[PDB]
Amino acid sequence: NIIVRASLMLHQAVTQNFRKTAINFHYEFNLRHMSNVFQGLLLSDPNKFTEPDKLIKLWIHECERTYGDRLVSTDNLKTYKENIFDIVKKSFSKFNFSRYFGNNPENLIYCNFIAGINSDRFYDQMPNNEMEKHISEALKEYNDNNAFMGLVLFEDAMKHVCRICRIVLPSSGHALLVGVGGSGKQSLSKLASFIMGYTTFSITISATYSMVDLRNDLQQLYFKCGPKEEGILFLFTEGQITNERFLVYINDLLSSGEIAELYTLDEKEAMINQVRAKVKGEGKPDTRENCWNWFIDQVKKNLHMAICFSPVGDMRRRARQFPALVNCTVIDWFQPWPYEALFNVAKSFLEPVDLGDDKVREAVVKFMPFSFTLVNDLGLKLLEQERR
Amino acid sequence: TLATTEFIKSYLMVKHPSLLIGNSGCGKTQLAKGILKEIVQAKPENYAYQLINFNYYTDSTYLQGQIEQTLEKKAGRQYGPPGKVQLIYFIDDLNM
Amino acid sequence: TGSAVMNYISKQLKDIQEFIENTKENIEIRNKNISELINVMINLEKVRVKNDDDVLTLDTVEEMLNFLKKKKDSDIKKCKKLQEEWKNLAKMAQAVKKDIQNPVKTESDKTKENIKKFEEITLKEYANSLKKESFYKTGVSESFKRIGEVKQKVDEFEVQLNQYEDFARIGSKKLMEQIRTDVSSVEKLWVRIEISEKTMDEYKKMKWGSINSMDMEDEIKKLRKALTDLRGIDKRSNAFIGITEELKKWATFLPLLGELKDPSMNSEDGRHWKKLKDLVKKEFDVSQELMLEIIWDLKLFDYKDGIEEITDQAKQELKMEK
Numbered sequence: 001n002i003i004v005r006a007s008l009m010l011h012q013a014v015t016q017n018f019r020k021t022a023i024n025f026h027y028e029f030n031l032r033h034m035s036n037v038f039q040g041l042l043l044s045d046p047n048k049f050t051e052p053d054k055l056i057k058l059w060i061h062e063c064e065r066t067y068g069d070r071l072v073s074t075d076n077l078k079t080y081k082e083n084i085f086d087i088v089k090k091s092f093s094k095f096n097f098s099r100y101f102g103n104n105p106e107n108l109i110y111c112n113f114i115a116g117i118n119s120d121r122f123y124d125q126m127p128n129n130e131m132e133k134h135i136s137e138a139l140k141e142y143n144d145n146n147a148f149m150g151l152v153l154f155e156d157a158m159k160h161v162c163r164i165c166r167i168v169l170p171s172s173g174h175a176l177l178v179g180v181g182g183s184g185k186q187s188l189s190k191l192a193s194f195i196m197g198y199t200t201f202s203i204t205i206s207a208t209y210s211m212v213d214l215r216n217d218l219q220q221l222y223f224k225c226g227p228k229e230e231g232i233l234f235l236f237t238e239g240q241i242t243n244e245r246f247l248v249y250i251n252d253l254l255s256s257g258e259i260a261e262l263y264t265l266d267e268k269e270a271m272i273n274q275v276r277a278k279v280k281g282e283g284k285p286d287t288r289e290n291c292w293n294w295f296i297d298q299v300k301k302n303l304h305m306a307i308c309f310s311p312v313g314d315m316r317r318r319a320r321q322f323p324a325l326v327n328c329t330v331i332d333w334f335q336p337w338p339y340e341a342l343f344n345v346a347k348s349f350l351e352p353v354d355l356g357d358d359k360v361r362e363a364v365v366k367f368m369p370f371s372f373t374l375v376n377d378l379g380l381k382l383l384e385q386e387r388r
Numbered sequence: 389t390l391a392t393t394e395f396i397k398s399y400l401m402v403k404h405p406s407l408l409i410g411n412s413g414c415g416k417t418q419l420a421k422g423i424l425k426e427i428v429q430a431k432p433e434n435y436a437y438q439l440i441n442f443n444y445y446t447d448s449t450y451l452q453g454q455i456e457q458t459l460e461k462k463a464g465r466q467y468g469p470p471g472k473v474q475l476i477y478f479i480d481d482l483n484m
Numbered sequence: 485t486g487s488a489v490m491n492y493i494s495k496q497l498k499d500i501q502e503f504i505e506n507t508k509e510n511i512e513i514r515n516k517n518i519s520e521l522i523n524v525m526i527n528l529e530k531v532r533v534k535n536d537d538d539v540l541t542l543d544t545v546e547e548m549l550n551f552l553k554k555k556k557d558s559d560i561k562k563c564k565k566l567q568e569e570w571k572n573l574a575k576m577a578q579a580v581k582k583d584i585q586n587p588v589k590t591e592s593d594k595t596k597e598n599i600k601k602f603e604e605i606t607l608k609e610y611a612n613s614l615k616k617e618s619f620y621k622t623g624v625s626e627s628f629k630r631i632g633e634v635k636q637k638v639d640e641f642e643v644q645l646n647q648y649e650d651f652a653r654i655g656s657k658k659l660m661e662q663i664r665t666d667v668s669s670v671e672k673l674w675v676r677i678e679i680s681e682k683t684m685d686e687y688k689k690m691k692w693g694s695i696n697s698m699d700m701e702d703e704i705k706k707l708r709k710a711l712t713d714l715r716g717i718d719k720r721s722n723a724f725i726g727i728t729e730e731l732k733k734w735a736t737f738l739p740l741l742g743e744l745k746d747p748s749m750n751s752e753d754g755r756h757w758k759k760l761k762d763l764v765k766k767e768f769d770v771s772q773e774l775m776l777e778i779i780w781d782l783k784l785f786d787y788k789d790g791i792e793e794i795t796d797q798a799k800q801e802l803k804m805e806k
């Protein structure tokens with residue numbers, strides 16, 4: 001009952017602290033955001049949580065991944081983190097949560113994978129040490145059976161992998177990734193997919209790509225997650241959208257498992273015949289359109305969506321034009337790369353190069369991020385003056 | 389919920405339409421969807437339901453498609469619902 | 485089960501008295517012994533281990549005595565007499581332990597010669613490993629047997645060094661670890677090369693187009709990366725460098741083979757395909773379905789740029805023809 005008082009108090013703080021506007025349209029905190037927090041406590045399997053104190057640490061994680069970390073700035077995230085800590089202080093006593101809300105805290109994450117990709121998947125706290133090891137290991141299994149991903153792993157990127165792997169764990173749950181240019185999200189989602197066991201799918205962009213060709217792919221995509229009952233991740237970028245009416249079919253898939261004018265009358269009946277074998281196996285003796293209402297529930301469980309929007313252009317308009325894209329999906333805003341990320345990246349790319357000396361080597365890897373950060377500052381200093 | 393649900397039911401048994409306003413919260417669709425299941429559970433012969441979400445690119449010609457998808461000639465009286473029973477329609481995102 | 489425990493204690497006291505008599509005869513035999521002095525020192529060490537156990541048994545006898553007295557006044561006088569017999573045996577043992585200490589000092593010096601021989605045994609195994617990896621030919625499966633026989637000869641040298649260390653009671657142990665890690669790494673290289681050789685043999689029996697170039701490349705590209713992942717002997721040697729060049733030749737061979745399997749040549753009919761064979765200046769065959777083995781021995785690496793020109797012409801020619 002204390003969690004339910006706590007989650008309510010949190011909703012009342014954020015809705016007051018963050019008001020919706022034409023910019024930051026998403027900041028509107030509806031009920032269904034609160035509903036996604038409690039969906040994360042259900043993912044928690046019993047017996048794996050003996051300690052009471054711990055179940056709170058899971059709820060705290062889940063709040064940040066749910067309707068935290070959808071903020072344009074780092075300054076908003078600082079106010080949001082402060083708002084929780086004080087609500088966590090009042091609600092929960094005899095339980096310390098210092099050093100998980102302080103300045104320079106210890107990263108906390110809850111994924112299905114802890115012991116690794118290979119071992120059994122129980123949803124619980126991952127230690128920060130094994131994070132670097134397991135995401136690295138998980139890449140090597142992807143660098144086997146798939147095309148070489150060629151990504152550099154920095155603390156913030158590993159966070160983004162785990163964050164997506166949560167968002168695509170529950171049945172109805174869908175992902176929406178907001179990144180500036182080369183943020184990570186498109187390939188990070190291809191990694192996330194493989195860690196979950198879901199095979200990634202992406203529509204092939206063509207000059208002669210029609211409505212009927214999309215509709216044909218959506219049927220085959222349903223067939224993979226419907227009777228065959230295989231988990232299929234669906235990656236969709238702004239580049240992949242040539243026509244606005246393609247994004248219609250998508251918004252229906254996010255709203256509910258049922259899509260209008262996807263299946264014909266014959267194909268629907270032909271699919272119900274295949275499902276009829278399954279429901280007899282499940283032990284629910286129904287030979288009616290209840291079987292079809294089971295199919296779309298099974299499809300929406302084994303079909304997740306990872307949509308990849310740029311912030312600056314063609315989002316505010318599409319968000320206003322389709323409510324599903326921003327409402328139904330759990331969004332995770334990508335901030336710019338931190339100084340700690342850039343330094344790790346620069347050192348990997350420059351590793352093959354000589355760079356003369358060993359002191360020089362140390363200074364040249366130091367320069368790359370220092371040069372990027374002060375140009376980014378001057379870019380905002382310039383913007384203020386001349387509007388460049 | 390219990391108050392509002394009771395009314396919408398009693399309204400659909402007098403063939404008087406309703407309309408559900410909300411700030412994208414308090415489960416307008418799910419309350420409505422829940423009610424339509426409760427009515428269908430009671431009388432599966434008399435009343436059937438079909439939920440049609442409204443996209444930004446839904447015209448008159450498209451809507452005619454969904455109406456024509458579940459209809460009959462019904463031996464005179466022009467278009468009639470299948471089974472000779474009263475089909476409930478539903479409409480979501482009527483605003484857009 | 486306390487009076488029964490006192491009876492079992494009395495039987496254990498009689499067994500220790502006979503065990504003491506046996507330990508005295510074992511002490512005199514080692515005295516008669518001192519090769520032969522080293523074997524006497526080993527028997528002296530086992531007797532010194534038996535003596536400390538007897539010194540503990542004598543104290544346990546005296547306690548089993550005092551337990552009887554308070555429980556059996558006579559049984560207290562029996563195990564007190566047993567402790568008295570144990571002290572007299574411990575006195576004769578200290579005299580034998582002094583003579584044993586003189587021989588143990590001579591044994592400890594010989595132990596250093598056993599440790600030096602172990603170091604020479606370790607260096608030879610390091611050199612032989614350099615000669616095993618080379619042995620060039622298709623005795624790669626057989627060299628595993630020659631490696632394993634070497635690992636058994638090293639493992640026999642380890643058990644001999646572990647026996648020599650027990651007699652005396654770091655560096656010899658580190659050398660054993662280093663050989664075991666070298667053997668493990670060598671075996672991993674032999675297993676990988678055998679898998680890569682099997683994949684090359686499987687590809688070699690394909691149809692003219694069953695390989696499909698890109699499908700061949702992906703497995704090698706995966707195999708070539710997963711080759712560099714293993715870190716045994718820091719590559720180099722000969723047999724290793726040769727197969728990485730063979731793989732690289734094989735890797736560079738497929739894009740050229742992909743152009744020979746491209747639809748513009750698959751069309752055939754015209755003499756544009758026969759002109760491709762005239763650059764090679766060798767005996768060639770045209771099969772819709774046949775082994776890629778002949779393609780690899782056809783020397784497609786030779787006249788590379790000449791072929792690459794005819795492939796581009798053939799493609800342009802098909803596109804217009806279509």
Ligand SMILES: Nc1ncnc2c1ncn2[C@@H]1O[C@H](COP(=O)(O)OP(=O)(O)O)[C@@H](O)[C@H]1O
Pocket residue numbers: 149150151152179180181182183184185186187188308
């Ligand atoms: N050569 C490359 N340069 C940059 N990123 C690359 C490269 N090759 C692959 N990637 C992957 O592309 C991902 C995202 O790049 P991009 O699609 O441009 O950004 P976004 O997904 O934000 O639109 C990164 O996570 C990275 O792993």
Ligand SMILES: Nc1ncnc2c1ncn2[C@@H]1O[C@H](COP(=O)(O)OP(=O)(O)O)[C@@H](O)[C@H]1O
Pocket residue numbers: 031032035323327410411412413414415416417418419
């Ligand atoms: N008692 C409830 N009955 C039904 N849905 C509920 C209830 N409590 C919470 N919900 C949740 O409310 C969410 C809000 O959906 P809703 O406001 O109808 O969306 P929209 O306004 O965008 O159509 C639903 O996803 C549902 O899970």
Ligand SMILES: [Mg+2]
Pocket residue numbers: 181182183184186
């Ligand atoms: Mg990008």
Ligand SMILES: [Mg+2]
Pocket residue numbers: 415416417418
């Ligand atoms: Mg709703």
